[PDB]
Amino acid sequence: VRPVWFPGNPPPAHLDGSLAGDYGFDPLFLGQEPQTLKWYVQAELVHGRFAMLGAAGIILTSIGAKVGLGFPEWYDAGKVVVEKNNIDFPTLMVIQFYLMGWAETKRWYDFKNPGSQADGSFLGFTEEFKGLENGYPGGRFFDPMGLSRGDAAKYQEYKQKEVKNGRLAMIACLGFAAQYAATGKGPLDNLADHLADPNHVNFATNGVSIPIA
Amino acid sequence: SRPLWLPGSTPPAHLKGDLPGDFGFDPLGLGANAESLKWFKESELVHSRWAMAAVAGILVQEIVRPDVFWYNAGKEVESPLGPLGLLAVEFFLMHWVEVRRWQDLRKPGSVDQDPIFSQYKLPPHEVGYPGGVFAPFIPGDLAELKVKEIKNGRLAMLAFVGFVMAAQVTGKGPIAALQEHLADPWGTTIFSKAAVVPGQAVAPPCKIPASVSYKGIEIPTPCFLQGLWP
Amino acid sequence: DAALPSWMPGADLPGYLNGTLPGDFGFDPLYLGQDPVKLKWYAQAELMNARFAMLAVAGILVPELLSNIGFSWPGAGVAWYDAGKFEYFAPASSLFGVQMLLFAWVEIRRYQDFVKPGSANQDPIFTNNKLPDGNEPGYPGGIFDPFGWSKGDIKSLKLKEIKNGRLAMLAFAGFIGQAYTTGTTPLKNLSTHLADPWSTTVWQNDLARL
Amino acid sequence: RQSWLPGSQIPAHLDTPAAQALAGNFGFDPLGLGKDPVALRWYQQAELIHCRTAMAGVAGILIPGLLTKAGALNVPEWYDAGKVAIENSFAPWGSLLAVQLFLCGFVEAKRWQDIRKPGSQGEPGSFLGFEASLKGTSELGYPGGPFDPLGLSKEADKWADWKLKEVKNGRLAMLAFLGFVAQKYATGAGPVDNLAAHLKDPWHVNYATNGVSLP
Ligand code: CLA
Ligand code: CLA
Ligand code: CLA
Ligand code: CLA
Ligand SMILES: CC(/C=C/C=C(C)/C=C/[C@@]12O[C@]1(C)C[C@@H](O)CC2(C)C)=C\C=C\C=C(C)\C=C\C=C(C)\C=C\[C@@]12O[C@]1(C)C[C@@H](O)CC2(C)C
């Protein structure tokens, strides 16, 4: 009855419509276990959560460039900030593993034990890290607006709006790398080239994308 | 039955016209949690009162001192009481005041007493609305003024952002920006200063320097969202 | 957890700071004194660190107050950190040997009072002299109260002792850092903060040194 | 209760009442090495004595190291202090370690038999009247008697505190010595010298700027 990724074909049996962004798209039956699918629902979110941060991060630093500002491009922002600020590179990445490997194993023991991390084992914070459901912690810190409570009919709508923007952010961050390896320039330089002449300045006219140039 | 932000519409279910200035405008669902509605009802009033005092601050300063420009006037005042002695007083004298206001938010019946003049006491008022000492000689109805505070307040919060975004685009004060608009309306708009067509983006430059010197170490002065301007 | 005075008026309380201890306002955010075997220790640990600080701050300021006025002392105007190298009738090792035996009497006399109150008030050789019974650890009385105080309103005097004490511990902890950063006499740091109070806070002296 | 990972299932051989009655029980055994009860009891005796030798050891490294960088001592670095103090001495190191292993071996072999049977050395006629005070306590690893001159044992409450304070200062000291060896191989300087190097420049002078966190 619901809209599916491919009209006509029915959704698979393990994939009734309750998740956000559910469109029955599991052709390889990778979510056929109901407990690995609990893991991949966690996995689709945090990939989409980082990609929404990422795709906004590529775009907003490329909006500033080509206008006249002193911004680097996203493939060259890595070198230019461990050189301008004299930041030693291994001591930057290790602290990234300390702070996030802290924040990740908390998730990795939310999945193993959802009632856990809420025993005052942390600095006294108990029900802030309680976790509402899979991939959606909530509480005081992760939802300071309090949008996951009050009306829950609009919260199910926000769940879908997160996954929809989260899918095409992953496609964008798969396309920023693809626009860079093919052409060799920034993303909004590729957009403005496509807006200069929409014919002949597309992907078909590189010779990197189709080898039948 | 009440007036709305958009008259044909309906207010959301969490807005029932109880609060002052409740015209039903919350499209982003932010007034759903009643724990967080009290935090926002406080923070709208605080954001309004500073902005009313700031907009009347810039307007009074512009009609008596055409010399200096308010965006730059945090740099040029030349106080004899030091650059950081001012900040040290303002830090301590606000970390007192705000924390009293914050404890009033947390427990409303907890902050009523003058701690050093215990014979004096605030009345048991409403949260965000102290009264007693802060409100003598109130004119007319109190709920009428409670809507007049927010309507003038919401007008002033949009006014201060209008002051800042005019101060970064034409770089002059908000009568000098008004005299630019009243001398020549058809050419001194933001739609006249800027346009983005699909193929090029014409934006105004800053009328603001990137940095300032100010007594030794330099202070970065950035144009708030330069690059994302139209 | 009552209508006791509080360090943050309206804040919630731990519950074990009802008011029997001298001058409490509930200030224990690290929850250090939940165990009463630690709170009984920490109460006496507060009084001794306080009383030695009231000796310290009055032992630093008053020899500097009556020296910048200008009197005639063998040690006059010498800094409190520069009083260790100053010479006396004996080297400072032998002085420290006398301290570690006279206080090894008194502290062990005081510690034997803490483990059993009411069982320390008797002299060794003068077995008529004793302090009167009913005292608590930290308040011996008797010859320790020669002027005849504490014969009424003892709670407010203990509250005055802990408030004049806690100010001194902050003042001696003041004396450590504020003589370590700028390296002056901490009575003369008041001179610069009264010369131009707005041009020398802790921040501008930090930032000039940084 | 208070596990090393708040989400983990604590292994069941640390939740028995003969294992939750133990200091430093944070549910940490990701190899299952103490599933056997006497193997837990033997490894509990190994942890108390690896930690007390480490607390005595680390206080023999940094306390004469901090009181050397602050003046008033001339004790050299701990990885060179074995080279010196043998010339301010009388025996060769072979003639000194053999008397050491005699003196230490008489102690350790008595602690060995008291682990095997508690109250072994409390049997009459072992020593010259001194064997009476060597029955230990009702739990092993904590002898008391002549090993408690100040008499802190006879409380029965505040007692699990002194247990858990000993183990946590003990486990920290074992990581401190595993520190000291590793921060001598990797940089060759002193441990207080490595503390001085990290304080003057935290964001460039660490183990990310030597060849041992190599990618
Ligand atoms: C980043 C990884 C990732 C992960 C783990 C998931 C996980 C999930 N998605 Mg999802 N999705 C993603 C990205 C991801 N998605 C992206 C980018 C899109 C847009 C194209 C979608 C669009 C989408 C739809 C439309 C639907 C799902 C659905 C699902 C669920 C069931 C399918 C399953 O078992 O997934 C298993 C997933 C993986 C094992 C990870 C994929 C990695 C593969 C094995 C590598 C190769 C992929 C591809 C060929 C390589 C392209 C790049 C390459 C050239 C370098 C599950 C929660 C269904 C659902 O229930 O919705 C909630 C559903 O209807 N997804
Ligand atoms: C998020 C969507 C998105 C958008 C809006 C753009 C936009 C643009 N891309 Mg681009 N791109 C994307 C994703 C996207 N890309 C991805 C995911 C890839 C990797 C396959 C590429 C690879 C790519 C190359 C190699 C080039 C561009 C170029 C361009 C520009 C010119 C248009 C063109 O040539 O069409 C390119 C259009 C596409 C490749 C398809 C659009 C996105 C589709 C719908 C992928 C979505 C996934 C699909 C629904 C499910 C996959 C099935 C699978 C899971 C089994 C234009 C600004 C060109 C350029 O630089 O111009 C000068 C160019 O050279 N893109
Ligand atoms: C025009 C805006 C406006 C209006 C209608 C109100 C209305 C109200 N306020 Mg409010 N307030 C405002 C601005 C305003 N306030 C600002 C900017 C601040 C921050 C200083 C406050 C701070 C404040 C507090 C702390 C309290 C109130 C309270 C009240 C209520 C009773 C007091 C009263 O009769 O005020 C009537 C207000 C007027 C008649 C406005 C007169 C304006 C004249 C024309 C002068 C304005 C110009 C001048 C240059 C301003 C600078 C003054 C000074 C900085 C030099 C009432 C709802 C009390 C309350 O709700 O408790 C029950 C209370 O405790 N307000
Ligand atoms: C006992 C209270 C006390 C007092 C009266 C002072 C007074 C002073 N300190 Mg000081 N200080 C204190 C405690 C105190 N300090 C403590 C505890 C430390 C250790 C963290 C320091 C560390 C310190 C440094 C490192 C420096 C000063 C400096 C100064 C002087 C400049 C004022 C300033 O910047 O404030 C400094 C204020 C603080 C450090 C905050 C301390 C706040 C206290 C603990 C609580 C407030 C007490 C009370 C409620 C208010 C005072 C009234 C009371 C005395 C009646 C001034 C004479 C500076 C100086 O010498 O320049 C001339 C300077 O460089 N102080
Ligand atoms: C004894 C000791 C050090 C003692 C050092 C001494 C006396 C030093 C003496 C000297 O310095 C001085 C005083 C002066 C110098 O001039 C001379 C010397 C002589 C050099 C360190 C112990 C050090 C002991 C260490 C480091 C042990 C670490 C073990 C760990 C972390 C194991 C954890 C686990 O085993 C568990 C717990 C459970 C399993 O399931 C999981 C894993 C993870 C396997």
PDB file of C-alpha atoms in Angstrom, chain D residues 12-194:
ATOM      1  CA  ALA D  12      29.970 -14.341  36.272  1.00  0.00           C
ATOM      2  CA  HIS D  13      33.166 -15.252  38.121  1.00  0.00           C
ATOM      3  CA  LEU D  14      33.449 -11.700  39.428  1.00  0.00           C
ATOM      4  CA  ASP D  15      29.851 -11.603  40.703  1.00  0.00           C
ATOM      5  CA  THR D  16      30.020 -14.540  43.087  1.00  0.00           C
ATOM      6  CA  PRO D  17      29.960 -13.443  46.756  1.00  0.00           C
ATOM      7  CA  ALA D  18      33.540 -14.670  47.187  1.00  0.00           C
ATOM      8  CA  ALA D  19      34.551 -12.285  44.377  1.00  0.00           C
ATOM      9  CA  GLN D  20      32.306  -9.295  45.039  1.00  0.00           C
ATOM     10  CA  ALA D  21      33.824  -9.337  48.540  1.00  0.00           C
ATOM     11  CA  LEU D  22      37.063  -8.141  47.008  1.00  0.00           C
ATOM     12  CA  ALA D  23      38.782  -4.806  46.569  1.00  0.00           C
ATOM     13  CA  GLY D  24      39.050  -3.399  43.080  1.00  0.00           C
ATOM     14  CA  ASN D  25      36.271  -5.535  41.618  1.00  0.00           C
ATOM     15  CA  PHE D  26      35.239  -3.445  38.623  1.00  0.00           C
ATOM     16  CA  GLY D  27      34.098  -6.413  36.553  1.00  0.00           C
ATOM     17  CA  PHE D  28      37.302  -6.357  34.504  1.00  0.00           C
ATOM     18  CA  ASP D  29      38.343  -9.749  33.184  1.00  0.00           C
ATOM     19  CA  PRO D  30      38.143  -9.776  29.371  1.00  0.00           C
ATOM     20  CA  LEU D  31      40.319 -12.886  29.177  1.00  0.00           C
ATOM     21  CA  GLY D  32      38.488 -14.904  31.835  1.00  0.00           C
ATOM     22  CA  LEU D  33      41.768 -15.688  33.585  1.00  0.00           C
ATOM     23  CA  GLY D  34      40.255 -15.942  37.042  1.00  0.00           C
ATOM     24  CA  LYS D  35      37.251 -18.144  36.346  1.00  0.00           C
ATOM     25  CA  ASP D  36      38.727 -20.871  38.517  1.00  0.00           C
ATOM     26  CA  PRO D  37      38.234 -19.816  42.162  1.00  0.00           C
ATOM     27  CA  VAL D  38      41.664 -20.712  43.529  1.00  0.00           C
ATOM     28  CA  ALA D  39      43.155 -19.187  40.386  1.00  0.00           C
ATOM     29  CA  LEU D  40      41.248 -16.027  41.266  1.00  0.00           C
ATOM     30  CA  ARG D  41      42.517 -16.322  44.843  1.00  0.00           C
ATOM     31  CA  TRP D  42      46.074 -16.842  43.598  1.00  0.00           C
ATOM     32  CA  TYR D  43      45.887 -13.970  41.113  1.00  0.00           C
ATOM     33  CA  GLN D  44      44.423 -11.759  43.822  1.00  0.00           C
ATOM     34  CA  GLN D  45      47.557 -12.400  45.814  1.00  0.00           C
ATOM     35  CA  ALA D  46      49.617 -11.634  42.738  1.00  0.00           C
ATOM     36  CA  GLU D  47      47.884  -8.286  42.262  1.00  0.00           C
ATOM     37  CA  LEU D  48      48.360  -7.122  45.845  1.00  0.00           C
ATOM     38  CA  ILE D  49      52.051  -7.795  45.703  1.00  0.00           C
ATOM     39  CA  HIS D  50      52.680  -6.549  42.194  1.00  0.00           C
ATOM     40  CA  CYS D  51      50.984  -3.320  43.297  1.00  0.00           C
ATOM     41  CA  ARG D  52      52.637  -2.838  46.692  1.00  0.00           C
ATOM     42  CA  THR D  53      56.068  -3.389  45.154  1.00  0.00           C
ATOM     43  CA  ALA D  54      55.069  -0.917  42.453  1.00  0.00           C
ATOM     44  CA  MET D  55      53.850   1.687  44.939  1.00  0.00           C
ATOM     45  CA  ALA D  56      57.107   1.323  46.822  1.00  0.00           C
ATOM     46  CA  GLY D  57      58.938   1.353  43.508  1.00  0.00           C
ATOM     47  CA  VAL D  58      57.286   4.393  41.935  1.00  0.00           C
ATOM     48  CA  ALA D  59      57.756   6.319  45.175  1.00  0.00           C
ATOM     49  CA  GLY D  60      61.411   5.339  44.810  1.00  0.00           C
ATOM     50  CA  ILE D  61      61.489   6.904  41.342  1.00  0.00           C
ATOM     51  CA  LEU D  62      59.469  10.100  41.288  1.00  0.00           C
ATOM     52  CA  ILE D  63      59.690  11.156  44.960  1.00  0.00           C
ATOM     53  CA  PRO D  64      63.513  11.267  44.674  1.00  0.00           C
ATOM     54  CA  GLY D  65      62.940  12.601  41.146  1.00  0.00           C
ATOM     55  CA  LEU D  66      60.590  15.446  42.006  1.00  0.00           C
ATOM     56  CA  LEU D  67      62.757  16.272  45.027  1.00  0.00           C
ATOM     57  CA  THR D  68      65.754  16.430  42.681  1.00  0.00           C
ATOM     58  CA  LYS D  69      64.273  18.723  40.035  1.00  0.00           C
ATOM     59  CA  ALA D  70      63.184  20.988  42.913  1.00  0.00           C
ATOM     60  CA  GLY D  71      66.648  20.943  44.467  1.00  0.00           C
ATOM     61  CA  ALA D  72      67.876  19.509  47.802  1.00  0.00           C
ATOM     62  CA  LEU D  73      68.802  16.099  46.337  1.00  0.00           C
ATOM     63  CA  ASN D  74      71.282  14.740  43.814  1.00  0.00           C
ATOM     64  CA  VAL D  75      69.705  11.351  43.092  1.00  0.00           C
ATOM     65  CA  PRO D  76      70.157  10.651  39.359  1.00  0.00           C
ATOM     66  CA  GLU D  77      67.666   9.143  36.958  1.00  0.00           C
ATOM     67  CA  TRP D  78      66.238   5.766  37.908  1.00  0.00           C
ATOM     68  CA  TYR D  79      67.531   4.049  34.773  1.00  0.00           C
ATOM     69  CA  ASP D  80      71.047   5.197  35.676  1.00  0.00           C
ATOM     70  CA  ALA D  81      70.787   4.967  39.480  1.00  0.00           C
ATOM     71  CA  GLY D  82      71.741   1.297  39.398  1.00  0.00           C
ATOM     72  CA  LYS D  83      75.023   2.206  37.744  1.00  0.00           C
ATOM     73  CA  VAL D  84      75.798   4.653  40.537  1.00  0.00           C
ATOM     74  CA  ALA D  85      75.339   3.620  44.217  1.00  0.00           C
ATOM     75  CA  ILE D  86      77.419   0.526  43.535  1.00  0.00           C
ATOM     76  CA  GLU D  87      80.608   2.628  43.722  1.00  0.00           C
ATOM     77  CA  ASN D  88      79.213   4.262  46.865  1.00  0.00           C
ATOM     78  CA  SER D  89      79.001   0.688  48.093  1.00  0.00           C
ATOM     79  CA  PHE D  90      80.923  -2.389  49.100  1.00  0.00           C
ATOM     80  CA  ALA D  91      79.868  -5.534  47.244  1.00  0.00           C
ATOM     81  CA  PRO D  92      79.645  -6.541  43.601  1.00  0.00           C
ATOM     82  CA  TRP D  93      76.102  -6.773  42.285  1.00  0.00           C
ATOM     83  CA  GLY D  94      76.439 -10.550  42.215  1.00  0.00           C
ATOM     84  CA  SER D  95      77.522 -10.534  45.860  1.00  0.00           C
ATOM     85  CA  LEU D  96      74.577  -8.251  46.660  1.00  0.00           C
ATOM     86  CA  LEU D  97      71.766  -9.974  44.741  1.00  0.00           C
ATOM     87  CA  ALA D  98      72.557 -13.363  46.266  1.00  0.00           C
ATOM     88  CA  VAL D  99      72.198 -12.024  49.807  1.00  0.00           C
ATOM     89  CA  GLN D 100      69.079 -10.239  48.531  1.00  0.00           C
ATOM     90  CA  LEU D 101      67.504 -13.457  47.250  1.00  0.00           C
ATOM     91  CA  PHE D 102      68.375 -15.120  50.538  1.00  0.00           C
ATOM     92  CA  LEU D 103      66.709 -12.352  52.547  1.00  0.00           C
ATOM     93  CA  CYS D 104      63.769 -11.972  50.173  1.00  0.00           C
ATOM     94  CA  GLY D 105      63.487 -15.708  49.622  1.00  0.00           C
ATOM     95  CA  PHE D 106      62.980 -16.455  53.286  1.00  0.00           C
ATOM     96  CA  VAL D 107      60.076 -13.991  53.309  1.00  0.00           C
ATOM     97  CA  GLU D 108      58.454 -15.035  50.028  1.00  0.00           C
ATOM     98  CA  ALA D 109      58.630 -18.747  50.833  1.00  0.00           C
ATOM     99  CA  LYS D 110      56.802 -18.062  54.096  1.00  0.00           C
ATOM    100  CA  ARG D 111      54.147 -16.073  52.298  1.00  0.00           C
ATOM    101  CA  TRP D 112      53.976 -18.962  49.796  1.00  0.00           C
ATOM    102  CA  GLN D 113      53.011 -21.454  52.501  1.00  0.00           C
ATOM    103  CA  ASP D 114      50.586 -19.037  54.133  1.00  0.00           C
ATOM    104  CA  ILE D 115      48.746 -18.710  50.830  1.00  0.00           C
ATOM    105  CA  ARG D 116      48.623 -22.510  50.545  1.00  0.00           C
ATOM    106  CA  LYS D 117      47.302 -22.824  54.078  1.00  0.00           C
ATOM    107  CA  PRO D 118      46.267 -19.669  55.976  1.00  0.00           C
ATOM    108  CA  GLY D 119      47.643 -19.632  59.471  1.00  0.00           C
ATOM    109  CA  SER D 120      50.555 -21.831  58.440  1.00  0.00           C
ATOM    110  CA  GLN D 121      53.198 -19.753  60.174  1.00  0.00           C
ATOM    111  CA  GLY D 122      51.026 -19.300  63.251  1.00  0.00           C
ATOM    112  CA  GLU D 123      51.692 -22.842  64.417  1.00  0.00           C
ATOM    113  CA  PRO D 124      53.703 -23.008  67.666  1.00  0.00           C
ATOM    114  CA  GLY D 125      57.403 -23.701  67.619  1.00  0.00           C
ATOM    115  CA  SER D 126      58.106 -22.231  64.182  1.00  0.00           C
ATOM    116  CA  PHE D 127      59.888 -19.147  65.410  1.00  0.00           C
ATOM    117  CA  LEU D 128      61.439 -18.094  68.677  1.00  0.00           C
ATOM    118  CA  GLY D 129      58.200 -16.826  70.150  1.00  0.00           C
ATOM    119  CA  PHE D 130      57.614 -14.581  67.145  1.00  0.00           C
ATOM    120  CA  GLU D 131      55.461 -17.091  65.223  1.00  0.00           C
ATOM    121  CA  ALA D 132      52.330 -16.214  67.213  1.00  0.00           C
ATOM    122  CA  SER D 133      51.742 -12.915  65.420  1.00  0.00           C
ATOM    123  CA  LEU D 134      51.905 -14.466  61.945  1.00  0.00           C
ATOM    124  CA  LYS D 135      48.420 -15.925  61.497  1.00  0.00           C
ATOM    125  CA  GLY D 136      47.363 -13.036  59.305  1.00  0.00           C
ATOM    126  CA  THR D 137      43.716 -12.082  59.327  1.00  0.00           C
ATOM    127  CA  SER D 138      40.601 -14.014  58.361  1.00  0.00           C
ATOM    128  CA  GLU D 139      41.318 -13.002  54.750  1.00  0.00           C
ATOM    129  CA  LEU D 140      44.704 -13.484  53.134  1.00  0.00           C
ATOM    130  CA  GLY D 141      46.917 -10.833  51.622  1.00  0.00           C
ATOM    131  CA  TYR D 142      46.356  -8.633  54.663  1.00  0.00           C
ATOM    132  CA  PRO D 143      48.497  -9.984  57.504  1.00  0.00           C
ATOM    133  CA  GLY D 144      48.373  -7.200  60.077  1.00  0.00           C
ATOM    134  CA  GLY D 145      49.933  -7.732  63.478  1.00  0.00           C
ATOM    135  CA  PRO D 146      53.582  -6.747  63.137  1.00  0.00           C
ATOM    136  CA  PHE D 147      52.757  -5.501  59.642  1.00  0.00           C
ATOM    137  CA  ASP D 148      50.328  -2.953  61.112  1.00  0.00           C
ATOM    138  CA  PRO D 149      52.228  -0.795  63.607  1.00  0.00           C
ATOM    139  CA  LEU D 150      49.696   2.039  63.543  1.00  0.00           C
ATOM    140  CA  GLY D 151      46.721  -0.283  64.016  1.00  0.00           C
ATOM    141  CA  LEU D 152      44.384   0.650  61.173  1.00  0.00           C
ATOM    142  CA  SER D 153      43.065  -2.874  60.693  1.00  0.00           C
ATOM    143  CA  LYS D 154      40.762  -3.136  63.708  1.00  0.00           C
ATOM    144  CA  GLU D 155      37.800  -1.185  62.360  1.00  0.00           C
ATOM    145  CA  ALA D 156      35.562  -3.611  60.324  1.00  0.00           C
ATOM    146  CA  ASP D 157      34.051  -0.491  58.715  1.00  0.00           C
ATOM    147  CA  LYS D 158      36.203   2.098  56.900  1.00  0.00           C
ATOM    148  CA  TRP D 159      38.089  -1.167  56.187  1.00  0.00           C
ATOM    149  CA  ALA D 160      36.851  -1.793  52.649  1.00  0.00           C
ATOM    150  CA  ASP D 161      37.862   1.809  51.972  1.00  0.00           C
ATOM    151  CA  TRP D 162      41.499   1.209  52.929  1.00  0.00           C
ATOM    152  CA  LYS D 163      41.380  -1.929  50.785  1.00  0.00           C
ATOM    153  CA  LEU D 164      40.072  -0.106  47.736  1.00  0.00           C
ATOM    154  CA  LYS D 165      42.341   2.884  48.294  1.00  0.00           C
ATOM    155  CA  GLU D 166      45.347   0.545  48.369  1.00  0.00           C
ATOM    156  CA  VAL D 167      44.364  -1.195  45.166  1.00  0.00           C
ATOM    157  CA  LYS D 168      43.582   1.965  43.204  1.00  0.00           C
ATOM    158  CA  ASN D 169      46.789   3.725  44.237  1.00  0.00           C
ATOM    159  CA  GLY D 170      48.368   0.339  43.569  1.00  0.00           C
ATOM    160  CA  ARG D 171      46.966  -0.172  40.076  1.00  0.00           C
ATOM    161  CA  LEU D 172      47.867   3.406  39.200  1.00  0.00           C
ATOM    162  CA  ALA D 173      51.440   2.778  40.294  1.00  0.00           C
ATOM    163  CA  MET D 174      51.726  -0.353  38.165  1.00  0.00           C
ATOM    164  CA  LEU D 175      50.709   1.711  35.144  1.00  0.00           C
ATOM    165  CA  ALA D 176      53.165   4.338  36.341  1.00  0.00           C
ATOM    166  CA  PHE D 177      56.082   1.917  36.196  1.00  0.00           C
ATOM    167  CA  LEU D 178      54.922   0.533  32.845  1.00  0.00           C
ATOM    168  CA  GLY D 179      54.903   4.212  32.028  1.00  0.00           C
ATOM    169  CA  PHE D 180      58.434   4.805  33.327  1.00  0.00           C
ATOM    170  CA  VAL D 181      59.946   1.964  31.287  1.00  0.00           C
ATOM    171  CA  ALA D 182      58.118   3.029  28.134  1.00  0.00           C
ATOM    172  CA  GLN D 183      58.882   6.734  28.516  1.00  0.00           C
ATOM    173  CA  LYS D 184      62.577   5.793  28.872  1.00  0.00           C
ATOM    174  CA  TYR D 185      62.789   3.658  25.756  1.00  0.00           C
ATOM    175  CA  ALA D 186      60.838   6.073  23.568  1.00  0.00           C
ATOM    176  CA  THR D 187      62.662   9.281  24.488  1.00  0.00           C
ATOM    177  CA  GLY D 188      65.583   8.507  26.817  1.00  0.00           C
ATOM    178  CA  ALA D 189      64.839  11.396  29.181  1.00  0.00           C
ATOM    179  CA  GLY D 190      63.579  11.377  32.740  1.00  0.00           C
ATOM    180  CA  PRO D 191      59.966  10.873  33.777  1.00  0.00           C
ATOM    181  CA  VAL D 192      59.809  14.279  35.444  1.00  0.00           C
ATOM    182  CA  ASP D 193      61.656  15.529  32.358  1.00  0.00           C
ATOM    183  CA  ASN D 194      58.848  14.060  30.257  1.00  0.00           C
TER     184      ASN D 194
END
